[PDB]
Amino acid sequence: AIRKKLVIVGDGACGKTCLLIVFSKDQFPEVYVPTVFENYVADIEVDGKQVELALWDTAGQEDYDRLRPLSYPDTDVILMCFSIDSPDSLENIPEKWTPEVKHFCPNVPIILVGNKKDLRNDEHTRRELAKMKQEPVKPEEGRDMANRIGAFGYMECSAKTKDGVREVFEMATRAALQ
Amino acid sequence: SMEMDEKDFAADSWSLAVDSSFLQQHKKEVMKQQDVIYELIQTELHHVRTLKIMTRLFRTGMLEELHLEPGVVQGLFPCVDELSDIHTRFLSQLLERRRQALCPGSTRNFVIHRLGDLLISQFSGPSAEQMCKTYSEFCSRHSKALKLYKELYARDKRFQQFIRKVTRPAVLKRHGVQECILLVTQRITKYPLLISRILQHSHGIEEERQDLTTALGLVKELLSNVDEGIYQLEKGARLQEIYNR
Ligand SMILES: CS(=O)(=O)N1CCC[C@@H]1CN
Numbered sequence: 388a389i390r391k392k393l394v395i396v397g398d399g400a401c402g403k404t405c406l407l408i409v410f411s412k413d414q415f416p417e418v419y420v421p422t423v424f425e426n427y428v429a430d431i432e433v434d435g436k437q438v439e440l441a442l443w444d445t446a447g448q449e450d451y452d453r454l455r456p457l458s459y460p461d462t463d464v465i466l467m468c469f470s471i472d473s474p475d476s477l478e479n480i481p482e483k484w485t486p487e488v489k490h491f492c493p494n495v496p497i498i499l500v501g502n503k504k505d506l507r508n509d510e511h512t513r514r515e516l517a518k519m520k521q522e523p524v525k526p527e528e529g530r531d532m533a534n535r536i537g538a539f540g541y542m543e544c545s546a547k548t549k550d551g552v553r554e555v556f557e558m559a560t561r562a563a564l565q
Numbered sequence: 566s567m568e569m570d571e572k573d574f575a576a577d578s579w580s581l582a583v584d585s586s587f588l589q590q591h592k593k594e595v596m597k598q599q600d601v602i603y604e605l606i607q608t609e610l611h612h613v614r615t616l617k618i619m620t621r622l623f624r625t626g627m628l629e630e631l632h633l634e635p636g637v638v639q640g641l642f643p644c645v646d647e648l649s650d651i652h653t654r655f656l657s658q659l660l661e662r663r664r665q666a667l668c669p670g671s672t673r674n675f676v677i678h679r680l681g682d683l684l685i686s687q688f689s690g691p692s693a694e695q696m697c698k699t700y701s702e703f704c705s706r707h708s709k710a711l712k713l714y715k716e717l718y719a720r721d722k723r724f725q726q727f728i729r730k731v732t733r734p735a736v737l738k739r740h741g742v743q744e745c746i747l748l749v750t751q752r753i754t755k756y757p758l759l760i761s762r763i764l765q766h767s768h769g770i771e772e773e774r775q776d777l778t779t780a781l782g783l784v785k786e787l788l789s790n791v792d793e794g795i796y797q798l799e800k801g802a803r804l805q806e807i808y809n810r
Pocket residue numbers: 688693694695697698786787788790791
């Protein structure tokens with residue numbers, strides 16, 4: 388199996404740590420959801436090809452501009468995350484996260500991922516956002532942002548229900564192989 | 566890691582580590598607090614274990630089996646002895662706090678009520694100054710270590726055989742040389758995440774809430790100082806490239 392490296396980036400409230408935990412764990416965390424993620428090396432077979440995909444989180448490095456780039460050397464695929472319950476997390480994608488990743492990871496595919504898709508139809512979420520003249524991110528808003536930033540593709544998932552999680556990591560593996 | 570500590574931290578949480586009849590005696594808020602303290606100690610035990618892989622398996626194995634040119638092993642594993650001393654001492658204090666809290670007749674049932682004071686001590690005075698100096702040096706030598714490793718693996722057959730041999734076992738799957746270096750660099754930025762969540766569940770005793778608030782502030786001051794002290798070293802960098810930063 389060939390070895391590839393994946394790094395997930397995005398704002399503190401984007402759900403990147405939860406996404407890595409849910410994908411890497413054999414059983415969904417029903418008793419305790421970990422606060423942090425160390426690393427993991429996933430065995431993935433996508434389109435007949437076997438890959439060892441090393442997974443890394445940038446959680447905790449958002450405020451540290453000289454420590455954070457140390458996560459980027461030899462990255463093969465970037466997951467660039469935002470939360471669907473946070474239009475603010477999507478606004479920070481084009482002029483903060485995108486120029487950074489393009490500088491430190493030139494020519495590395497970026498997949499834009501809309502996390503927490505289950506909250507798009509959550510009434511508590513819609514009520515809270517409506518107080519700030521906002522609403523959950525729409526699918527076309529995510530696709531348009533991915534198109535604008537030069538992303539390899541746009542995908543959505545829910546770490547809570549696991550829907551779409553396997554597909555995100557299988558596609559990230561295909562992107563890393565290209 | 567030693568078997569006694571691995572077994573004490575084998576469970577996914579504190580609520581699964583203690584006896585169910587002991588868990589039933591506590592309120593939900595205490596269980597949530599203890600689950601996060603358990604995660605801080607469990608991840609510290611794994612971080613010390615990563616440092617032992619670097620010093621004992623890789624570094625010492627290269628010195629005892631390979632003919633590397635002088636200063637090559639120090640370049641691959643910068644500051645590892647200092648990092649091991651800092652974290653082994655911290656882990657010893659965390660495990661002694663847990664051990665003193667065990668119920669008589671038990672090796673697994675405990676509640677840690679006073680973590681804040683231990684964290685203030687770790688992240689203040691000489692031990693904090695040493696952590697700041699060591700991580701500023703380590704993180705500035707991180708890129709150079711990765712490049713030195715890649716160069717040796719691509720050009721030296723005996724180095725390649727040594728690496729493939731000692732990283733073959735399944736227990737080393739996540740702990741190759743480059744993975745260990747990044748695990749160490751990322752450790753320091755995990756502390757505020759863990760301390761903030763412990764604090765969220767430590768409002769019951771005002772002295773404890775205050776001590777964890779002070780500890781969180783000290784950790785952030787340390788990280789800010791480390792981040793400000795980093796400038797990546799590059800082998801063969803010329804003075805002109807440096808003074809034109
Ligand atoms: C060395 S440090 O980063 O931990 N730092 C913070 C407190 C005091 C000291 C500065 N003099």
